[PDB]
Design a protein around this ligand. Structure first.
Ligand SMILES: [Mg+2]
Lengths: 99, 99
């Protein structure tokens, strides 16, 4: 689709059974998602927020659907305020900026 | 133009005489730029970063050029780590996300 930017670009994603609202965020390198159960193996990672650094769990090779477009990539899981789709998944769905 | 997202989407902007590198950031509501001299009237604003909240100066109705596309809008000026073009200017240049 084509997304204008007058409003936050919140889309529905499908991940690990579940529907979630998430932000399409071209200023984010990585994808970070609120607390959820993902199956396989993970490692801990630190990432920045307004408070300081939060610890999150890194799951690699996770299947996510983003507005009907399926991607595989790393998803970080932890106490983020906002569900953020970053560039590591936006490249996977072929998302560009256009003007 | 059309911008893929494999790399940070850093463009050249022209503002108040000067060339600057800045991030096209659809996760940012507002535009924040490193220390510079802008003419007219301003007010102070607080905004979030990794350390906590920083004070910035708000200048309204500023002319900025972004990859050859001229926009008018609010620019915040202060000790931000990264020059961020947010949605308040991206809408002004007709920037969309596409996939
Ligand atoms: Mg951000």
């Amino acid at each position: 689709p084509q997304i204008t930017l007058w409003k936050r670009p919140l889309v529905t994603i499908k991940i690990g059974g579940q529907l979630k609202e998430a932000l399409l965020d071209t200023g984010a390198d990585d994808t970070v998602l609120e607390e959820m159960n993902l199956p396989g193996r993970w490692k801990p990672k630190m990432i920045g927020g307004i408070g300081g650094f939060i610890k999150v769990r890194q799951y690699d090779q996770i299947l996510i659907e983003i507005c009907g477009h399926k991607a595989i990539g790393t998803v970080l899981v932890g106490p983020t305020p906002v569900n953020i789709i970053g560039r590591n998944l936006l490249t996977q769905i072929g998302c560009t900026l256009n003007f």
